[PDB]
């Protein structure tokens, strides 16, 4: 009886397993963008992600992740409110079962069709596990999806998911350049947090982009064909796999902008 997000293993379950779930640094959380403060001292994010290595793509039951390698400073994120230097490990989506909702974080309480993460974790800490158990370990840079006209960088994504409809498939994904999935725009809000899904552990600095990036419909239809059952097993649609927004408690919202 494993988490996931059905009725009987989703969100409001998962304190049981981690009571984390119910920590002072959560996440998504909604972004109230009046009462989110311009911070001038914040600098421009710095996204080098000229040199990425994809790798492979993974249904791991939950999403699909696109995974990177890791092993040498070759695509990174720096800047914006971060010290030091977090490299990219994988992206992966959270999106629904209709283009009303999907997003974890949401704007004004307004929920996007998806919301892609880039997952990043601080070199000082010399691998992803060690990373997680420090309250700066990781940054995650979250980027709105809504339905409109395609994103042709989205498409060799969207062309392989057929190849892992179940749990535990996984493709070779090697060339992908992951700078064809950002908005024009690094405008950013950003606060601490968490993971958004178990094991819950409090050590994202999240950085979420203002700007939203467009899919189409098409694209997005074929996410929601995904499964996150393995090969097999009775089809249950890979949708809504979000978590919905989280108490701020006594944190505060920065922009990088006016
Ligand atoms: N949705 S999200 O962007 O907040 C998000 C949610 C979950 C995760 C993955 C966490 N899995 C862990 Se904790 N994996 C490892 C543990 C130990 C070791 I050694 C290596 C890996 C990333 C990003
Ligand atoms: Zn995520």
């Known amino acids: 009886h494993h988490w996931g997000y059905g009725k009987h293993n989703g969100?409001?379950?998962?304190?049981?397993?981690?009571?984390?779930?119910?920590?002072?640094?959560q996440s998504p959380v909604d972004i109230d963008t009046?009462?989110?403060?311009?911070?001038?001292?914040?600098?421009?994010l710095s996204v080098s992600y000229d040199q990425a290595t994809?790798?492979?793509?993974?249904?791991?039951?939950?999403?699909?992740?696109?995974?990177?390698?890791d092993s040498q400073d070759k695509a990174v994120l720096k800047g914006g409110p971060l010290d030091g230097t977090y490299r990219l490990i994988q992206f992966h989506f959270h999106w629904g079962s209709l283009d009303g909702q999907?997003?974890?974080?949401?704007?004004?309480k307004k929920k996007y069709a998806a919301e892609l993460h880039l997952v990043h974790w601080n070199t000082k800490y010399g691998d992803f596990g060690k990373a997680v158990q420090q309250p700066d370990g990781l940054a995650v840079l979250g980027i709105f999806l809504k339905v409109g006209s395609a994103k042709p960088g989205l498409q060799?994504?969207?062309?392989?998911?057929?190849?892992?409809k179940t749990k535990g498939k996984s493709a070779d994904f090697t060339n992908f350049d992951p700078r064809?999935?950002?908005?024009?725009?690094?405008?950013?809000?950003?606060?601490?947090?968490?993971?958004?899904?178990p094991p819950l552990l409090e050590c994202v600095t999240w950085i979420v982009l203002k700007e939203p990036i467009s899919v189409s419909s098409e694209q997005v239809l074929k996410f929601?064909?995904?499964?996150?059952?393995?090969?097999?097993?009775?089809?249950?649609?890979?949708?809504?796999?979000?978590?919905?927004?989280?108490?701020?408690?006594?944190?505060?919202?920065?922009?990088?902008?006016?």
């Open 224 to 258: 929601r064909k995904l499964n996150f059952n393995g090969e097999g097993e009775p089809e249950e649609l890979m949708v809504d796999n979000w978590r919905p927004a989280q108490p701020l408690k006594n944190r505060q919202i920065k922009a990088s902008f006016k």
């Open 34 to 44: 009046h009462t989110a403060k311009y911070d001038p001292s914040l600098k421009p």
């Open 102 to 108: 999907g997003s974890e974080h949401t704007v004004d």
């Open 54 to 69: 994809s790798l492979r793509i993974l249904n791991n039951g939950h999403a699909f992740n696109v995974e990177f390698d």
């Open 11 to 25: 969100p409001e379950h998962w304190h049981k397993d981690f009571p984390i779930a119910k920590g002072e640094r």
């Open 180 to 197: 064809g999935l950002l908005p024009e725009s690094l405008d950013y809000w950003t606060y601490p947090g968490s993971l958004t899904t």
């Open 156 to 164: 060799k994504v969207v062309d392989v998911l057929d190849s892992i």
